[PDB]
Amino acid sequence: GSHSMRYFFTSVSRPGRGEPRFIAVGYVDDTQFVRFDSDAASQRMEPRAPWIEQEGPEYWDGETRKVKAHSQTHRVDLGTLRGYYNQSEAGSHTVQRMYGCDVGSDWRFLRGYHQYAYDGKDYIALKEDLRSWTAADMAAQTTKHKWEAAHVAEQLRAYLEGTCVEWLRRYLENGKETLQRTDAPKTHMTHHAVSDHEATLRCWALSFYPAEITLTWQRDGEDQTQDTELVETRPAGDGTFQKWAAVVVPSGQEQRYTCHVQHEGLPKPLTLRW
């Protein structure tokens, strides 16, 4: 399968006093591996996965330098955006940025991304071709035209197709015991009578990685969505994920219902039946 490296940055202005609050996190696929928090005492990029601790002091110094530089850039950006949107200095506002690259199953560059939001809404994004920009509104047109003139996309493309992919490959190798391992969901069904005549069947998927999964209920061989409930995939806290799907059924008719579980950790979809 393909793999991704993504960095997520959030900068929140603090009108009452001081510099913005800045949090940066790095992920390989669904695994967080680094973090920086401006409100933490270390003022360093910090490891959040064992395999990144294989990196020497030069890595941590280098990533700390770059992440602090990103924090200052976002601080500048918050000021500029308040200007673009004609906002007062009194309110708190948020800049978010995400960038990164995917490698395909062939171990080669597959795609790149670099995009920004302001106050929770799309602002500007590098397009799939990595050569041009999508500006969401007229304020973002200012940014787009400036970055086109300065050939920013060409600079980003070099990182996204080169450096980014090289590091992702390095991380995948060093962390192969976890990053390259799938954890198939541990599945089971529970039964909860809601009366003498109806019961809830809940189909559980636990301890899976990565997060992508599909759970579907069928009744007598056809998809059933009525009288179902599905929760959003949620983190277990130990690096894995959880999901469940439930249906209410007439007591005594449980055998008609099947839960179908699709996950890349499974050679073939599972079918559960009470």
């Binding site: 960095y7 770059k66 530089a69 850039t73 500048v76 500007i124 920013v152 590091w167």
Partner: peptide, 10 residues
């Protein structure tokens, strides 16, 4: 690893 951004600004 992070991009080592000259730097580009909004």
């Amino acid at each position: 690893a992070l991009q080592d951004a000259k730097e580009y600004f909004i």
